[PDB]
Design a protein around this ligand. Structure first.
Ligand SMILES: [Mg+2]
Ligand SMILES: [Mg+2]
Ligand SMILES: [Mg+2]
Ligand SMILES: [Mg+2]
Ligand SMILES: [Mg+2]
Ligand SMILES: [Mg+2]
Lengths: 222, 233, 195, 212, 226, 204, 125, 196, 195, 196
């Protein structure tokens, strides 16, 4: 029997800062126990200061990104070159995904950018289009390895102030772009150590009011 | 939904400093029966592209006709059909990739794995993969089926990353490809000794080599091997 | 849903229908009215798959109300039951059939007679002195076979109905949270608010 | 999941948890399970998250079109039936939905409709849906009165979700409260279950089984 | 898992990677897959890890007793015969796939063994999920009359092919060299090409960060005198 | 249906400078239903500590079994069993049920009384030994624990620093697992003193 | 056939003596002398290789035997009985210990196992 | 697998390819499928490698013990022992074995034992997946009382075709010659037999 | 069978167990006592597959009574529960396992403390202040979590138990025909004949 | 079924057995499996009789209509029409067809269309259940540019062996010769070919 779905592995991570946002993902593409590519870009600049990644089954992932990029193009044509806001992009993606409710895009989608007040924004989608704005979201193979670490180190969960013994929580102080990138790199380094589908390279896209910037880092190739 | 009937095995390929190399054997298997011994599975499109196909042969022959039709169609009302508006490897791939994904999305796939190898207008090497699921990926080395498991490890020792491509000559690349084909003949039960090899170079163009054979094989050591454990005679 | 009973006496038809609505593990409601008034002198109770029951009942109600306005005339219980049977007989060979069983209790103003029709989801119609759907008949029919007379009063019918409900409450494993009872006669449809 | 809604003297209380799970894996603790259909209507989300999101936002569009055409607020009866008729068309296809459509109008008063993906549409006073529904029902049934104050009713809804969050493994994270009045709904905050549990334990004397 | 065995001039060498996995998760990053059956008979195991370690200890135990009974040093063919008859009896349910190598008074030997009880003879062998990557290297570079240094080089290169290309294999290369008329030399972590880079941050917490309800001393000592 | 995830729970063990730490959650459940918040999963036989995750009936059965066996060991050997020896005994005992196994994920922790060397080990349900230098994880949130431990851990932590590291590893892993939590215990083990600490955590 | 001797061949005499054990000890008394001495950093065991014939190769007859890598044994009395005891002792060191604990038994416990085998030949049928 | 045994004037010759596959992967390309159960009684194995190795080992044990008591066994006796194991354990075995041997009284004999555990004495026998493709060729070309050189050519040509068409067969062609003169092993490489 | 509850208060253990026995379609009995007295101060209630429940309970009873005679001594509740757990833990890997869940309520005369143990058919034992088997806990635990105090009197325990049974009777689909309640304390075991 | 087509010096010859079975029952022992789609373009059928008859009838219709408009079709054209039907309806067909024909420009040509719907132009082709047993024989004995008498002997001997070993094949050997001279039918009975 023909199985229309597959699993190309990969892991992605979106974090929203105070006036910035990052969307990172490893560059390894796989089937079963084989490596297809050590560098296959997974996070894409879609225009209008929006970055996107559709992790999971790479064919559906590529199709969805392609269709969203196309939606941005036609949004400009139809509405006098108006900038597509991150919240509007998110709602649009829901309809793209739910359109195939009964033959879904087998992907976990994340987008990142800035909201209309200039603050950092990350949106997270399931395969059939349910979505939510979030501060922190890992997706894909090693998501279960990364999220608990982020709960502890970004939101300071289970951390209290010394001397008070559980009475006062550690205050939620804002993180800089340099601080976030450190946590992203350590998340993927740790994921690479313990998950076989994670490795080769890490590509991070950083979104600010100035535009989209890229950073690449080597990961272990075993 | 179907099942493949007459099938072709591994297609292997890699980038080198001035272009790309691609190779595939000339066998059309019918299950374990090695039925057809003169099947060409590398199909050139113009003078800048070679499409290598594995999997179902009837679907290969269909894809072959689509590419033939693509060349005809591109020439229509096109004075620059043999110049600026000729078919690029990137155009040919994107078309195939569209077809493959559409077909899987109708639950009626073309049961193939395809590698498009070529050189672009600006001299850039093109090497990308697509299969029956519509999955696509690029790499300095690419291979299908058994080639993925056995050829890639060998080819990756020559070009391990992007920066190794300018350091790799056509002689070294062809040598590595030919050796991989020998290894596949040793170890793939659905392979044959006869194969085809194509080189697409930005300077010397498309060189298509037919009727190649696996040679320099090691078998002599077999004479000393006796029994399965305790037997001496 | 679960238990729906019907009994035709001398001058009226009495329909009893359970109040429970269970969605799996919890009883979501204990006051559900599993009936629709099709016309002033025609009442239909129903039981079957969730959603389909009310959808079908309201669809029938709309059609009978449409007929009533068009002709300025109330269809006979027999005519209404024949319409309902055809809809279910059509439904059974559809892509997705209505999984609904009904009892139609009406008073024919022309003949001055009460009438009770039992129709299952296949479109199997029978006119009866008393009827039920599901397992309800298994517990109650032996009592109805014994005590039923065609010349019973409405009060005697209600007493025989109480005995049937008591037997159900004793031997049935499920708690159906009692029944809503309605009477159909020459003066129309009314609900017995204490049962 | 645990979602509840109940009618009372002061209108409707809606209370939900915040947890979403994929098997044993806790995907999210910050899920918004109350959909704001418009400023007057609320819907709860249980079953398929996408199905509830997509179709209850769509419901908001249909309600807006109704009041543009009819120059009048849509009834809770009519709004709930638009949704139940829609999902009934999809019956068999695999939609998963268990929701309470909540509203407060002049002609109806406070009204709650349980709407289901098998096509069920039930009017009622107290509804409770999700994996932790049985736990919340216990607290509701034993403490519910029509003449509850808005303050006490809000607490009852909060306490009932807490009861479920504690016992049901697939419920937790935080509690979202809403109070529906005739002039519209009013949001009554996000309450972390972790902090709420210890607070309630001390102040109420409950959960003596747990060491704090 | 990637495991290889290579014959050479005066003996045999076996090698293996050091990654053990449950599904897609790496359980141990420095696993020891080279097992000792007897001082100069070593084997490497792929498949169900408990079965490979369990079956090598059982045969290794019986081999030791046999060596004491017969006053002779154990032979590789004995280990082979005992392993295959045990595995055949259990009809593949004991999921042990082994490459057995060693030296004895008869000479140097190299065998493979599949879980159902079938055995094979060869000058070079590979087993496990990375066996195809390893065999590609072996088929490209193997020749007759290899030296000790050439065989160690070939064996480790074959394991490296598995490490880099097979997701089921990784971390380090273990090697064991068994030469005729010599002690077998076990080279644990012969190669170490996968050391983790320094993290960007230290995650050492301030003392008193964790909330505590109760403290108590645990009595690990026995009942006291007096 | 899956026996190893009916009851839920987790165990984690770490090594430090002249010390080891082992920790567990306190939950026992029947799938979605929470049943007990006092189900401890760490036991000790002399100075050797054993954590067990998985099917609770087997957790209880194995504890009673290893108490049985270590008691007879002590009577015959005239000394308490060591971590290295006990590890082999657990492995032996599990593999004897190769084709009808206990659905468990044991974890050994302790300090060798003679050498003073810290020791930890893990097993699959069938007896395969995982002897890691750094840490061992087990249970329904093992993936989460691997993620926490891999980033939080550093070698040669002092006892009171190791406590913070292992506690934060457990807590944050358990909060991302539906079937773990409802309290937690941490053992800090030195050559001749052991401290047991119950942690305050969210009760959902 | 079948072993129809299911009863004890060693029994208490009226005086409380176990005859067969006493007689076994008499056979030990006739045996060639062997000895053992314990030092602070080692132990030594020794005996005479009483060769039955000069044509016999007495190196092929081992009176001193390795039981485990750290345990050795020597005897006085009947050689064949010793040989089979060494076989049983070597095996029991594995079956009742090494295959359980992954290490060789301590001297006192292996001795205990050998003693148990000898005790059973004193009571079994 | 492609295996065959052929009787001729001076005795019998066994022939086999050397390919063993796990699916489409060639697990061993230099396999020895000609196995010795006695000095001048050999067999060709097809089917489950574990099963046929287990059976052959047991037969070798039985014939060794037979020889110690009753002297050299006949080829018929060896075939009977093979059959007894295959027939009685037919439910749990996948084995197709050809037994070939040389007596001085009986000369060259060939027995084939297919899946069921039946025995068939034949002038020559073919078996294994690749044998299907050479039923026509072998039937047309086999003659009785061929010479050693003719029988080697017959087997070499036959297995050459079997290898050519069957993907499960390949590698080298191994042969074992059984005559009064003794036991001779032959090997033929791809470059030789492919050009035939 | 269906619902079995347990609650340990200050000075006693209270076990509540349903009276209904349903064999598929009919309720065959509405006065069934799903409990056995193992010893003068130890009571065990049970629920599970038909036949196995009583067979197991009586088997345990016989064994504890045998121990009591042999030693002229009553085993502690803890000891009895450990015996029962082992039997079930043995049973789960048998050819045909006992499909039986139990609650053991006892008063330890040595420690002067009530004790409640919950053991499922797998041999999963837990000591609790209050417990249940099947779906009973889903409805009742939220009430018990709220109202339970360790210093409750027997009368307060019974009142909290009534509230639990009322919630069960409201929201459960099945009619379990009420409960038989028994109290275990220092004076032994007695039945509350009006509940 | 045993079917084959062989090109030779003067054109091409098609050959076939005559046995059609329903399980082990021979439903027809005198079947004509050589079917005419045009004057000098014939085909051999294997697989579902209903399917191959339906396909052949449609092809004959297509080539008749082709001829009315564009004159005599090539053998390649006929094969393409066969392929189009077999490939596009692969999910619902079980057909293995060999197409053989004679042009004056191209002379004798043979095309085989296996299950999948692929096309392969060959010097000769074999198909049907019985073809498996003669891959070896046919490969060893086929030569290009044989005479008419040699090609008849080659086919007669080949199908003789296929019939001998395949239970699904049997009866008479039918042949059809396609040359410039015209169309000649040949038949060979069991008593003739069995003694070969
Ligand atoms: Mg990795
Ligand atoms: Mg919870
Ligand atoms: Mg077998
Ligand atoms: Mg949790
Ligand atoms: Mg071949
Ligand atoms: Mg329990």
């Amino acid at each position: 029997q023909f199985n229309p779905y597959g699993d190309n592995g990969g892991t992605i991570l979106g974090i929203a800062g105070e006036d910035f946002a990052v969307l990172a993902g490893d560059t390894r593409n796989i089937t079963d126990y084989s490596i297809n590519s050590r560098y296959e870009p997974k996070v894409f600049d879609c225009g209008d200061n929006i970055v996107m990644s559709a992790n999971g089954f790479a064919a559906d992932g590529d199709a969805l990104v392609k269709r969203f990029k196309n939606s941005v193009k036609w949004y400009h044509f139809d509405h006098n070159d108006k900038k597509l806001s991150i919240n509007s992009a998110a709602r649009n993606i829901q309809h793209l995904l739910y359109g195939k409710r009964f033959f879904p895009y087998y992907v976990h989608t994340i987008i990142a950018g800035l909201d209309e007040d200039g603050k950092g924004a990350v949106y997270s989608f399931d395969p059939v289009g349910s979505y939510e704005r979030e501060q922190c979201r890992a997706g894909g193979a090693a998501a279960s390895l990364i999220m608990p670490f982020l709960d502890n180190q970004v939101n300071f969960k289970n951390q209290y102030e010394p001397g008070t013994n559980g009475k006062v929580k550690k205050p939620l102080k804002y993180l800089s772009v340099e601080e976030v990138i450190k946590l992203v790199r350590d998340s993927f380094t740790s994921a690479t150590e313990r998950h076989i589908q994670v490795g080769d390279g890490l590509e991070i896209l950083i979104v600010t009011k100035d535009g989209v910037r890229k950073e690449f880092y080597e990961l272990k190739r075993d | 939904t179907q099942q493949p009937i007459v099938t072709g095995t591994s297609v292997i390929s890699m980038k080198y400093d001035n272009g790309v190399i691609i190779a595939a054997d000339n066998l059309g298997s019918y299950g374990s029966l090695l039925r057809f011994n003169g099947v060409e599975r590398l199909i050139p499109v113009g003078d800048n592209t070679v499409v290598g196909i594995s999997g179902d042969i009837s679907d290969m022959q269909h894809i072959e006709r689509l590419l033939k039709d693509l060349v005809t169609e591109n020439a229509y009302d096109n004075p620059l059909a043999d110049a600026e508006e000729a078919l690029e490897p990137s155009y040919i791939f994107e078309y195939l990739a569209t077809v493959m994904y559409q077909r899987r999305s109708k639950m009626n796939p073309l049961w193939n794995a395809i590698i498009v190898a070529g050189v672009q207008s600006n001299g850039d090497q093109f090497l990308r993969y697509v299969n029956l699921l519509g999955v696509t990926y690029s790499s300095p080395t690419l291979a299908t089926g058994f080639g993925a498991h056995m050829a890639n490890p060998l080819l990756r020792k020559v070009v391990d990353r992007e920066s190794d491509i300018p350091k790799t000559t056509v002689q070294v690349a062809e040598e590595a490809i030919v050796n991989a084909m020998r290894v596949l003949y040793y170890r793939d039960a659905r392979s044959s000794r006869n194969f085809s090899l194509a080189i697409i170079d930005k300077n010397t163009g498309l060189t298509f080599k037919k009727n190649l054979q696996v040679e320099n094989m090691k078998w002599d050591f077999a004479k000393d091997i006796k029994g399965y454990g305790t037997q001496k005679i | 849903m679960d238990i729906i009973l019907g009994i035709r006496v001398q001058d009226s038809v009495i329909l009893a229908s359970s109040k429970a609505v269970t969605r799996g593990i919890s009883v979501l409601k204990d006051s559900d009215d599993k009936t629709r008034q099709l016309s002033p002198h025609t009442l239909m109770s129903f039981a079957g798959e969730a959603g389909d029951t009310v959808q079908f009942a309201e669809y029938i109600q709309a059609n009978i109300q449409l007929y009533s306005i068009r002709e300025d005339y109330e269809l006979s219980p027999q005519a209404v039951s024949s319409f309902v049977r055809q809809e279910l007989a059509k439904s059974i060979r559809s892509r997705r059939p209505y999984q609904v069983n009904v009892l139609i209790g009406g008073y024919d103003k022309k003949k001055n007679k009460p009438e009770l029709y039992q129709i299952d989801y296949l479109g199997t119609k029978v006119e009866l002195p008393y009827g039920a759907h599901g397992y309800s008949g298994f517990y109650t029919f032996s009592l109805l076979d014994h005590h039923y007379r065609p010349d019973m009063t409405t009060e005697e019918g209600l007493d025989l109905l109480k005995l049937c409900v008591q037997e159900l409450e004793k031997r049935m494993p499920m708690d159906f949270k009692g029944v809503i009872v309605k009477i159909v006669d020459k003066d129309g449809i009314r609900q017995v608010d204490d049962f | 999941t645990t979602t509840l809604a109940f009618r009372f003297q002061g209108g409707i209380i809606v209370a939900v948890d915040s947890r979403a799970t994929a098997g044993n894996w806790v995907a999210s603790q910050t899920v918004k399970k109350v959909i704001e259909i418009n400023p007057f209507l609320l819907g709860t989300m249980a079953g398929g998250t996408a199905d509830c999101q997509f179709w209850e936002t769509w419901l908001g569009s249909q309600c807006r079109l109704h009041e543009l055409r009819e120059k009048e607020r849509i009834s809770v009866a009519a709004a709930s039936k638009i949704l139940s008729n829609l999902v009934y068309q999809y019956k068999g296809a695999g939609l998963s939905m268990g929701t309470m459509i909540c509203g407060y109008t002049r002609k109806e008063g406070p009204t709650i409709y349980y709407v289901d993906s098998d096509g069920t549409r039930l009017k009622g006073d107290i509804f409770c849906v999700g994996s932790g529904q049985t736990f919340a029902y216990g607290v509701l049934d034993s403490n519910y009165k029509w003449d509850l104050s808005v303050e006490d009713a809000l607490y009852l809804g909060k306490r009932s979700i807490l009861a479920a969050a504690h016992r049901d493994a697939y419920s937790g994270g935080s509690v979202n409260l809403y109070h529906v009045t005739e002039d519209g709904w009013i949001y009554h905050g996000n309450h972390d279950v972790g902090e709420l549990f210890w607070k309630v334990k001390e102040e109420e004397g409950s959960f003596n089984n747990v060491i704090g | 898992t990637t495991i290889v065995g290579v014959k050479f001039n005066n003996g045999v060498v076996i090698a293996a990677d050091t990654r053990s996995t449950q599904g897609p998760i790496v359980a141990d990053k420095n696993c020891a897959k080279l097992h000792r059956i007897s001082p100069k008979i070593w084997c490497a195991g792929a498949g169900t890890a408990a079965d490979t370690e369990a079956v090598t200890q059982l045969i290794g135990s019986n081999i030791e007793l046999h060596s004491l009974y017969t006053s002779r040093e154990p032979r590789v063919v004995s280990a082979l015969q005992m392993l295959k008859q045990h595995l055949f009896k259990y009809q593949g349910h004991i999921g042990a796939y082994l490459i057995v190598a060693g030296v004895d008074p008869t000479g140097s030997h190299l065998f493979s063994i599949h879980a159902h009880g079938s055995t094979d003879v060869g000058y070079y062998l590979s087993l496990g999920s990375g066996s195809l990557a390893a065999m590609a290297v072996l088929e490209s570079h193997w020749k007759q009359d290899l030296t000790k240094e050439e065989a160690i080089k070939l064996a480790s290169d074959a394991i490296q092919a598995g490490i880099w290309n097979d997701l089921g294999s990784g971390s380090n290369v273990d090697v064991c060299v068994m030469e005729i008329g010599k002690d077998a030399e076990y080279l644990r972590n012969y190669l170490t090409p996968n050391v983790r880079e320094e993290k960007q941050k230290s995650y050492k917490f301030p003392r008193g960060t964790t909330a505590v309800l109760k403290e108590s001393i645990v009595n690990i000592c026995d009942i006291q005198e007096e | 249906s899956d026996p190893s995830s009916i009851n839920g729970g987790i165990v984690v063990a770490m090594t430090g400078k002249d010390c080891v730490a082992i920790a567990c959650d306190l939950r026992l459940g029947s799938q979605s239903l929470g049943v007990s918040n006092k189900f401890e999963k760490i036991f000790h036989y002399g100075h050797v500590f054993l954590g067990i995750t998985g099917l609770a009936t087997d957790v209880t059965t194995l504890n009673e079994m290893f108490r049985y066996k270590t008691n007879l060991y002590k009577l015959k050997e005239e000394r308490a069993i060591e971590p290295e020896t006990f590890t082999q005994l657990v492995s032996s005992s599990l593999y004897e049920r190769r084709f009808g196994p206990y659905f468990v994920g044991p974890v050994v922790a302790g300090i060798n009384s003679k050498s003073g060397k810290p020791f930890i080990a893990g097993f699959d349900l069938i007896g395969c030994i995982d002897e890691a230098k750094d840490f061992i994880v087990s249970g329904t949130a093992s993936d989460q624990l691997f993620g926490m431990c891999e980033s939080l851990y550093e070698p040669n932590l002092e006892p009171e620093d190791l406590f913070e590291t292992i506690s934060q590893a457990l807590l944050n892993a358990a909060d991302r697992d539906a079937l773990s939590g409802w309290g937690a215990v941490v053992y800090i083990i030195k050559k001749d003193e052991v401290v047991k600490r119950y942690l305050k955590m969210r009760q959902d | 056939m079948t072993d129809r001797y299911s009863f004890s061949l060693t029994t208490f005499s009226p005086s409380g003596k176990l005859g067969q054990i006493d007689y076994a000890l008499t056979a030990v008394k006739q045996g060639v002398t062997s000895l053992g001495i314990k030092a602070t950093n080692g132990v030594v065991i020794a005996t005479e290789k009483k060769s039955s014939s000069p044509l016999a190769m007495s190196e092929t007859l081992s009176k001193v035997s390795l039981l485990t890598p750290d345990i050795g044994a020597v005897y006085s009395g009947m050689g064949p009985d010793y040989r089979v005891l060494v076989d049983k002792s070597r095996k029991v060191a594995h079956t009742s210990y090494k295959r359980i604990y992954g290490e060789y038994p301590p001297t006192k416990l292996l001795v205990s196992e050998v003693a148990k085998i000898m005790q059973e030949a004193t009571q079994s049928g | 697998t492609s295996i065959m045994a052929v009787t001729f004037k001076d005795g019998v010759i066994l022939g086999a390819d050397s390919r063993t596959t796990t699916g489409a992967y060639i697990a061993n390309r230099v396999t020895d499928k000609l196995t010795r159960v006695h000095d001048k009684i050999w067999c060709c194995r097809s089917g489950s490698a574990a099963d046929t190795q287990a059976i052959a080992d047991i037969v070798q044990y039985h014939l060794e013990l037979y020889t110690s008591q009753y002297g050299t066994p006949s080829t018929e006796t060896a075939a009977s022992v093979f059959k007894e194991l295959c027939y009685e354990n037919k439910d749990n075995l996948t084995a197709g074995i050809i037994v070939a041997g040389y007596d001085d009284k009986n000369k060259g004999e060939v027995y084939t034992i297919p899946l069921g555990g039946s025995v068939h004495k034949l002038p020559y026998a073919i078996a294994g997946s690749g044998s299907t493709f050479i039923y026509g060729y072998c039937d047309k070309n086999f003659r009785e009382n061929m010479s050693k050189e003719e029988t080697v050519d017959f087997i070499k040509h036959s297995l050459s075709q079997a290898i050519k068409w069957d993907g499960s067969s390949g590698g080298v062609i191994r042969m074992v010659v059984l005559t009064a003169a003794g036991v001779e092993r032959l090997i033929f490489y791809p470059d030789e037999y492919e050009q035939l």
